[PDB]
From Swiss-Prot, chains A, B:
Organism of provenance: Homo sapiens (Human)
GO biological process: GDP-D-mannose biosynthetic process from fructose-6-phosphate; GDP-mannose biosynthetic process; GDP-mannose biosynthetic process from mannose; mannose metabolic process; protein glycosylation; protein N-linked glycosylation
InterPro entries: HAD-like_sf (IPR036412), HAD-SF_hydro_IIB (IPR006379), HAD_sf (IPR023214), PMM (IPR005002), PMM_cap (IPR043169)
Effect the entry attributes to changing F115L: In CDG1A; partial loss of activity
EC number: 5.4.2.8
GO CC term (a single one): neuronal cell body
PANTHER family in UniProt: PHOSPHOMANNOMUTASE, PHOSPHOMANNOMUTASE 2
Protein name (Swiss-Prot/TrEMBL): Phosphomannomutase 2
Impact reported for A229T: In CDG1A; uncertain significance
Metabolic or biological pathway, per its Swiss-Prot or TrEMBL entry: Nucleotide-sugar biosynthesis; GDP-alpha-D-mannose biosynthesis; alpha-D-mannose 1-phosphate from D-fructose 6-phosphate: step 2/2
GO molecular function: metal ion binding; phosphomannomutase activity
Residues involved in Mg(2+) 2 binding: F217, D219, T222
Length: 242, 242
């Protein structure tokens, strides 16, 4: 029946870390004459504008920056959400206060700054502080592998807060993320499942476990297609939609 | 007697929070034909370039952003220091740990992120967090006047860290600075002292006790002059050097 194509941005519509080409932009505008199209990415609206152009909301039926916490439909804001509004200020502060006190008790070779980075979709917590140098990240990650600093911190947090519907995810060298359950790319699906689409295709290049596309790829509401590069995506769309 | 004029920037060479005028810019360049000139300010190099021009290091013999923690002479960057190398990692962490535990206990309407910002010459500490929105900044600021949050925080820190060689200074709306004794504007004098100048003039608009020019003004190494406005600075310079 009616259908929607949903695309990851970076690595799917664009070369990794790169802006969309005029030829790809032209392709999608011709594809949009056949099927509705939308884009979803983890970055804020400003970066999405850098990757796809400042007129992004006019070129796609849906634009979902920040995994859909910001949502545009047919050119106007459909909806906006953030962690403080959803969790409430009290719980935000309990979580922040617990982390600050915990980090004050961690014995480390070095502590710097930005221990708590507040983002609309998550809190990124770092015992050493995100401001540390690359050399200092490596020192910390080596201590962390031997002492399980982040593992233990996250375990204690799961015991204290997870009944409030919070997921904790370790990643990289120095930090972990705290965010409400399901606030990955799947969040955007709430904004399209009511609009009467019989099939919602999803194209992404990080569909395997740990990738930022895995949960939306696996969700039963999407017909997921893994792609290796934008050219692989365009070859699949030629076979699917002529 | 070869001499040097050191100028505070904001309120002294420029109107408060504004770029220098082309008229004042031409005046200082004519003054440079008779005497070496230099600028000092607490802001970073980018802000100094915004106020005085991207070619500032070419237009002024000395440029001392961040009170001189970053220092240019004749267009080239000088020998550098930072707070963790001067204070030691142990004192840095005791300061950071104490501040983190204290912030955890403060009752605020809202808390966000970047509670501690690690800078070259200071630790900047915000009870609400530097990443807060403008509305949240004003909200906290009005609360701080009523409840004296920053003032009590700083009073407690002066007791806990007595004799460790630290200085604490509340500024702006949301934060206070912790820096080593003497790393106010006086810091830059290390780069001009005993370097051939019989007189080091200094001009500043906040030379009163509590002002960010007080210590450099009262330092014996400088012939200090208090100015009431950029036009008053020009009056004194025309008196002294014409
Ligand atoms: Cl922080
Ligand atoms: Mg991707
Ligand atoms: Mg699926
Ligand atoms: Mg001033
Ligand atoms: Mg003096
Ligand atoms: Na729904
Ligand atoms: Na800056």
């Amino acid at each position: 029946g009616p259908a929607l194509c949903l695309f990851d941005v970076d690595g799917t519509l664009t070369a990794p870390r790169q802006k969309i080409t005029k030829e790809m932009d032209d392709f999608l505008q011709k594809l949009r004459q056949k099927i509705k199209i939308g884009v979803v990415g983890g970055s804020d609206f400003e970066k999405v504008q850098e990757q796809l152009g400042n007129d992004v909301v006019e070129k796609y039926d849906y634009v979902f920056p920040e995994n859909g916490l910001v949502a545009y439909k047919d050119g106007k804001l459909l909806c906006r959400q953030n962690i403080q509004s959803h969790l409430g200020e009290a719980l935000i502060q309990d979580l922040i206060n617990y982390c600050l006190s915990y980090i004050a008790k961690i014995k480390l070779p070095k502590k710097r700054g930005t221990f708590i980075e507040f983002r609309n979709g998550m809190l990124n917590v770092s015992p050493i502080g995100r401001s540390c140098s690359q050399e200092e990240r490596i020192e910390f990650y080596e201590l962390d592998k031997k002492e399980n600093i982040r593992q233990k911190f996250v375990a204690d947090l799961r015991k204290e807060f997870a009944g409030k519907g919070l997921t904790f995810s370790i990643g990289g060298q120095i930090s972990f993320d705290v965010f409400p359950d399901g606030w990955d790319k799947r969040y955007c699906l709430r904004h399209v499942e009511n609009d009467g689409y019989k099939t919602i295709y999803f194209f992404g290049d990080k569909t395997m476990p740990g990738g930022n596309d895995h949960e939306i790829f696996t969700d039963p509401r999407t017909m997921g297609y893994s792609v290796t590069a934008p050219e692989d995506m365009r070859r699949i769309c030629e076979l699917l939609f002529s």
